[PDB]
């Protein structure tokens, strides 16, 4: 994973996201959704999803939430006050903690001012405390600003490492983007049916065709402009649409 003071930032983009494999995996110790309850994720579409990743203590997972305070949310990773995404977290004691202490997971414990939301700060300047210019030298009136979790496998829960992923769905002003997977039943034939072909909504009997579209045309129209043929997206075969009987 990535440190807590330099979190990662993956920009998930156009694709088919299935938050159900996440939601029901039962391996997550914390799955909170804020802008939107979890079950309705596989039924919405946004412009971008960002995923941030890092590793913290066990009992600092309560500062990854909109409107908190503490050494993590103050200056390591700050969530805006109208967050929209979801926060996922699971214990990882066996992977990240090693006998003798894993001193490779640091965090920032001194900063001039709390972070703006989603702001990031990887500098390593000596936190000058005393009015006396530090001059880049340690000692008194000057602290190094990074400390390290010394994780060890015999730590009580709440001191064992937890891995955290923060999904943030954003909606700029584009034309569209990633959404949840769609569905489909079994295209029936020779029965007055109520059909939807990726947008085309209609009613009628469907029948095997013998016309030949050009290999970019979806549906065919008549003179007087009524849909009378379609192409099945999955199998790519042309089917005529006749109305069902009235009189």
């Amino acid at each position, epitope marked *: 994973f990535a440190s807590v003071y330099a979190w990662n930032r993956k920009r998930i983009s156009n694709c088919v996201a299935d938050y159900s494999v996440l939601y029901n995996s039962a391996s997550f110790s914390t799955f909170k959704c804020y802008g939107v309850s979890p079950t309705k994720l596989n039924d919405l579409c946004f412009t971008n999803v960002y995923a941030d990743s890092f590793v913290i203590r066990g009992d600092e997972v309560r500062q990854i939430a909109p409107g908190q305070t503490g050494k993590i949310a*103050d200056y390591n990773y700050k969530l805006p006050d109208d967050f929209t995404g979801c926060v996922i977290a699971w214990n990882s004691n066996n992977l990240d903690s090693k006998v003798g*202490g894993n001193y490779n997971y640091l965090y920032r414990l001194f900063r001039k001012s709390n972070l703006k939301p989603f702001e990031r700060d990887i500098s390593t300047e000596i936190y000058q*405390a005393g009015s006396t210019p530090c001059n880049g030298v340690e000692g008194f009136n000057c*602290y190094f600003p990074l400390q390290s979790y010394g994780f060890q496998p*015999t*730590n*009580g829960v709440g*001191y064992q490492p937890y891995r955290v992923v923060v999904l943030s769905f954003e909606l700029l002003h584009a034309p569209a983007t990633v959404c949840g997977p769609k569905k489909s039943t079994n295209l029936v034939k020779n029965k007055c049916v109520n059909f939807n072909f990726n947008g085309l909504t209609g009613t009628g009997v469907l029948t095997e065709s013998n016309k030949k579209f050009l290999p970019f045309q979806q549906f065919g129209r008549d003179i007087a402009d009524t849909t009378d043929a379609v192409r099945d997206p999955q199998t790519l075969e042309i089917l005529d649409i006749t109305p069902c009987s009235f009189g």
Partner: antibody
Amino acid sequence: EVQLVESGGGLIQPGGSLRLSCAASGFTVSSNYMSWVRQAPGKGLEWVSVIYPGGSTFYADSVKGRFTISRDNSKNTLYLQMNSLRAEDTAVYYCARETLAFDYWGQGTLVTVSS
Amino acid sequence: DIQLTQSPSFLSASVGDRVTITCRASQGISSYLAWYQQKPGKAPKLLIYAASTLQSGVPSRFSGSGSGTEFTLTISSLQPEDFATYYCQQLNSYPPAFGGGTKVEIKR
């Protein structure tokens, strides 16, 4: 180097109040973790409150609410305005500059008798 | 669940000797705490850092021994001038738990 001195202790009754001034004799109380440590006489210590370099409170368990900490950087003073003392705090108060551990923490008293 | 640290108090010794004080930790803590010297009627002074890296401005008589739990301090070659109590703490976590304190007597 740093020689923190505090003032403001005395005697009062319940529902009273009192401001304590951890006078930062010494430098830069604007950017340091500071805290209040309390002990009743004949007893072990106890922790009260804490300010962050950036502003946060996190009060203790029993003194949750009814108790307020602040700083003043231009005056180099920490301010502890309390009120409604259950008189059950009659104690010897310390203010210490947490520097990755603690140390550097003066002394100062108080009593909250009902007379 | 908070940690409750314990100590075998009321020590008694003579000068120039070895004495050893342990500090229980009734939960899985890591290895970051600290010892203090509390002379009577005064302010504490921390000796052992967040483990054993003794903080500066102290003599060579203290030897903090750290672990996962069951931390232990040891004074070797005593000197008549350490009449006070010694506490444990527990840095890192905000509300921290303190020890019980061990007074140490000096035989004559």
